[PDB]
Design an enzyme around this catalytic site. Sequence first.
Site, short mmCIF file in Angstrom:
data_model
loop_
_atom_site.label_atom_id
_atom_site.label_comp_id
_atom_site.label_asym_id
_atom_site.label_seq_id
_atom_site.Cartn_x
_atom_site.Cartn_y
_atom_site.Cartn_z
N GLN A 62 -42.55 26.80 5.78
CA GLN A 62 -43.02 25.59 5.06
C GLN A 62 -42.47 24.32 5.73
O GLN A 62 -42.90 23.28 5.33
CB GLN A 62 -42.58 25.64 3.61
CG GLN A 62 -41.08 25.52 3.43
CD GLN A 62 -40.66 25.69 2.00
OE1 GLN A 62 -40.37 26.78 1.54
NE2 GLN A 62 -40.66 24.58 1.30
N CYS A 79 -43.01 25.23 -1.36
CA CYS A 79 -42.72 26.64 -1.59
C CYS A 79 -43.73 27.27 -2.52
O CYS A 79 -44.14 28.43 -2.32
CB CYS A 79 -41.31 26.80 -2.19
SG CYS A 79 -41.13 25.91 -3.81
N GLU A 103 -52.02 27.20 2.90
CA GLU A 103 -51.14 26.44 2.03
C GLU A 103 -51.46 24.95 2.07
O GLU A 103 -51.28 24.26 1.06
CB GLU A 103 -49.68 26.65 2.46
CG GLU A 103 -49.16 28.07 2.31
CD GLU A 103 -49.66 29.00 3.40
OE1 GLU A 103 -50.01 28.51 4.51
OE2 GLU A 103 -49.62 30.23 3.17
N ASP A 123 -48.94 29.01 -10.67
CA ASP A 123 -50.03 29.14 -11.63
C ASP A 123 -51.04 28.01 -11.49
O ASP A 123 -52.24 28.24 -11.63
CB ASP A 123 -49.48 29.19 -13.05
CG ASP A 123 -48.95 30.56 -13.42
OD1 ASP A 123 -49.10 31.50 -12.61
OD2 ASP A 123 -48.39 30.73 -14.52
N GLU A 140 -56.05 30.17 6.49
CA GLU A 140 -54.99 29.52 7.24
C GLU A 140 -55.48 29.05 8.61
O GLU A 140 -55.10 27.96 9.07
CB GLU A 140 -53.85 30.51 7.38
CG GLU A 140 -52.61 29.98 8.00
CD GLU A 140 -51.78 29.21 7.03
OE1 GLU A 140 -50.92 29.86 6.38
OE2 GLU A 140 -51.95 27.97 6.95
N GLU A 198 -49.63 21.66 8.11
CA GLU A 198 -49.05 20.51 8.78
C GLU A 198 -47.78 19.98 8.12
O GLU A 198 -47.19 19.02 8.63
CB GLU A 198 -50.08 19.36 8.84
CG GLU A 198 -51.42 19.71 9.47
CD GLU A 198 -51.34 20.23 10.89
OE1 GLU A 198 -52.36 20.76 11.38
OE2 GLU A 198 -50.27 20.11 11.53
N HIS A 203 -37.34 27.28 -6.55
CA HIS A 203 -37.93 27.77 -5.31
C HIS A 203 -38.88 28.92 -5.59
O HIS A 203 -38.48 29.96 -6.11
CB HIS A 203 -36.83 28.20 -4.32
CG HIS A 203 -37.34 28.45 -2.94
ND1 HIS A 203 -38.32 27.68 -2.35
CD2 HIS A 203 -37.01 29.40 -2.04
CE1 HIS A 203 -38.58 28.15 -1.15
NE2 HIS A 203 -37.79 29.19 -0.93
N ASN A 249 -39.54 35.08 1.78
CA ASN A 249 -39.32 33.64 1.76
C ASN A 249 -40.33 32.97 2.70
O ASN A 249 -41.13 33.63 3.39
CB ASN A 249 -37.87 33.34 2.16
CG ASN A 249 -37.35 31.98 1.63
OD1 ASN A 249 -38.06 31.19 1.00
ND2 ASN A 249 -36.07 31.73 1.88
#
Length: 220
Positions: free
Chosen positions: A19, A25, A50, A71, A86, A92, A163, A187
């Site tokens: 990330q 996260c 993401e 959620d 992706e 970015e 997190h 992670n």
Amino acid sequence: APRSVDWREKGYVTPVKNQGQCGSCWAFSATGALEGQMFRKTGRLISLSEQNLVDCSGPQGNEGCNGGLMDYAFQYVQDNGGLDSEESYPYEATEESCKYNPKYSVANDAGFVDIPKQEKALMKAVATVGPISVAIDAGHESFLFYKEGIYFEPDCSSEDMDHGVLVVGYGFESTESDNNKYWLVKNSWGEEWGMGGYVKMAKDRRNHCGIASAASYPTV
Ligand SMILES: *[C@@H](C(=O)NCCc1ccccn1)[C@H](O)C(=O)N[C@@H](Cc1ccccc1)C(=O)N(C)C
């Protein structure tokens, strides 16, 4: 339930991502769970965007690099009718305006399921659904420096999580203290953190770091 589970062995989990310096996260947790449920449905593992979530899921309540909830991300995919790959909408690590293009959508969901706030319920969900989105208290130096073994932090909060991460399984290994059970957690800090980007979080130790307090998954 099974005594050990690892959804990576069943093909449900993309490689570890990073990330960067954006507080996104929640978006990586959400893409990880949706990647698992899409694979469950279709047999195709496709990495999801993401950046799409960071840029576009504000109306559902998310705040980009300033934080969010998994959620609200699942709600966005439902309301929006899709989520880009992706590769089509790359990461970015900075909030920008929404560039979602439905032609490049590769995933959908019909809502989400929240898991009761108990580690026994989280275990049943992991054992029967796939990877599960969770939030933990990662706000301790010990978490940054984690290399291997079962992570146990006495100052960890079961109520104040900061997190979003992904539970991909659980298991056990013998330890000095005989607290042997762990959650296997993906992670989003790159593979140079922890054990190839993964951490074994203490399991059945009074909801350690809040891992069962905000657990959910998307309905596909
Ligand atoms: C998560 C994030 O990006 N964390 C990266 C920075 C960091 C470094 C070291 C330790 C911890 N964090 C975001 O900050 C975020 O979205 N936070 C959420 C996580 C969450 C909590 C509860 C339910 C779902 C998701 C958050 O803290 N809140 C309160 C929404």
